[PDB]
Amino acid sequence: MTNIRVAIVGYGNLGRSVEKLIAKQPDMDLVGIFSRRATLDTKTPVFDVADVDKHADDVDVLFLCMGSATDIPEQAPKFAQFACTVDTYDNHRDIPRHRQVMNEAATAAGNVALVSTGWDPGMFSINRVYAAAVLAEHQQHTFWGPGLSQGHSDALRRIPGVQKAVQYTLPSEDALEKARRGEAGDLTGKQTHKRQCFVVADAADHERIENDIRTMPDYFVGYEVEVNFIDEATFDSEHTGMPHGGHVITTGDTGGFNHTVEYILKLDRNPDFTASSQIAFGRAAHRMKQQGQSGAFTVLEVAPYLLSPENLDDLIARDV
Amino acid sequence: MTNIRVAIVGYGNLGRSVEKLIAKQPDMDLVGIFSRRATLDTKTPVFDVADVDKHADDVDVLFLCMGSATDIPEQAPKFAQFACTVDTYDNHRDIPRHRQVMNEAATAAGNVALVSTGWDPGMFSINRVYAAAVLAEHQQHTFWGPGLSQGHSDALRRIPGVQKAVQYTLPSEDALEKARRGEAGDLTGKQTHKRQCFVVADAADHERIENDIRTMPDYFVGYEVEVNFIDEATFDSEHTGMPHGGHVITTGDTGGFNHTVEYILKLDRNPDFTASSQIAFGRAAHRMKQQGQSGAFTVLEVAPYLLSPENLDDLIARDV
Ligand SMILES: NC(=O)C1=CN([C@@H]2O[C@H](COP(=O)(O)OP(=O)(O)OC[C@H]3O[C@@H](n4cnc5c(N)ncnc54)[C@H](OP(=O)(O)O)[C@@H]3O)[C@@H](O)[C@H]2O)C=CC1
Ligand SMILES: NC(=O)C1=CN([C@@H]2O[C@H](COP(=O)(O)OP(=O)(O)OC[C@H]3O[C@@H](n4cnc5c(N)ncnc54)[C@H](OP(=O)(O)O)[C@@H]3O)[C@@H](O)[C@H]2O)C=CC1
């Protein structure tokens, strides 16, 4: 009767965080990890991503943890055919297309696919919509960092020549304070964030790599970008942590009265929080299937209570 | 296009706030105000609350704005038989009961009743359940203010000699900082908030009044209190407003990694923001009725997109 049979697809940072965190769940059993690699450092059973079809009946929801920049678009739709799915796809300009192709696959299989979960997209997306809906007349801005962005970091490593790479998003603190006072209108995220890259690569490949970085669509174009090529020794010791966070600020006026809505996240480890978010929506995905639903849904489409491990009545009697 | 026809029951501060705000809604038409009083200071049509049945067909959703104390529990169910209803009922300990009773009336009439909307019962409820869901093991606290506490203000006003008074509940800056780092597990309610009083009275009574305040049990004893005796002119110009707000702070450890989720609300006028929320949910109740649902629902059971005046598609392409 109880217990969601879960499985991870892609054993990177995010993949390792969801494996770790499934242990804190009272209703989930990790059945295994589907990977492109043969030897993983874990006691959890490893399967070939190609043998997913063979495990279709013993898995309720697959947690997609492959790279957004190149893996998700091509691979994601494939898995929706075998079980419910949850991803953290973050290329915003590509979300409507992704939602459509995942809906096709999920609807045909009778499954539920929760797309673009996490904190951004994910929690920040939900907040943007709530604050904007409530405050008719409003101004809204999202700030990231300072911290390590997993999507931009992975995008850098797919560039040939890049041995090791990491990217930090640096927000304009000046603009963040202006937002709080409702005086940052017309200012965009591309204008309030700097992107600094720390890359380890052969000197000969520098020019090319730098070109591919500054011209990469969505992740980098239109942003101020600093590229640093550093010694591998310095990399392995200075760039090991994965902190991050952000602020979604919304101000509104009701006729001579201002209101400020602020959602803040201070994450010690980006992979871990993202993984916690993904797991919660994994629970909702499954519950939605149990109730007769199918297709791809964004975070804006699931009622909040579906994420909780506790039943509705307990939440209504304690948290409302 | 179609345009949702709305009516306001009860014309207090909340009712006044929803009235002026509907003018800002792109899809709502105000049909009238159902009041117990015949002559209101407004251009909008006023109708006897006993004649709601006579207008049952001219209205889509009724914004219930009477007092929570006694009005909502006895009157609210009766209105649910005429149209969709939205209330901001804040008696936390009575919510499960109010929901069950409203669900009986709403289901019978085939309507949708959205109960307990607003900011604490409302936005804060949504956030509590969200952050608690995501962060498996966690600590959670909610702080109110700075804001005018009617309960404590009234305690101040019944002191002999007090001409005018008001009390502001402020969050302890020390306590907020501790909750942010997950160190507030041992803090008591008398340690999480400070109390600031503004009393107008003859100087001859200042010493006795200050003592009456500082020793008043259940309201100020054990708390850190601040008393200020101001001029009546300073009172009328600076303490007639209705500010409020609060902080919802949640933390969680993921294996030596801490995460902080903080939701902040700074409101210049309490009833104005409450009205904004109540209105957004009125749109949601109407859309839910169009989709074939009925019965009563809390803010935890409605999907975020349902509150927005935009198309789901525009939302997905722009805010996710
Ligand atoms: N929406 C949101 O708020 C958030 C989204 N994200 C997203 O998370 C995604 C994942 O980032 P992250 O997990 O840190 O990236 P990693 O590069 O660490 O993991 C990516 C993929 O690379 C593979 N791989 C991993 N290690 C190696 C290795 N050592 N040698 C060769 N191949 C390897 C994996 O597949 P395999 O094991 O099969 O080989 C893994 O699935 C990003 O694309 C980003 O978009 C992250 C945070 C938040
Ligand atoms: N959930 C949340 O976050 C929040 C909830 N609340 C809730 O909303 C409610 C707000 O009501 P609010 O408008 O502040 O209170 P009021 O006392 O101003 O209004 C209450 C009722 O009294 C009546 N009445 C109003 N003015 C007068 C008058 N001058 N003379 C005599 N009768 C009058 C009205 O009915 P009629 O017109 O029929 O006479 C009105 O419906 C509260 O009860 C509270 O529970 C408020 C803020 C936030």
Ligand SMILES: N[C@@H](C[C@H]1CC(C(=O)O)=NO1)C(=O)O
């Ligand atoms: N998508 C991000 C999560 C947040 C952080 C971010 C950025 O720094 O630009 N954008 O969104 C990630 O993969 O880590």
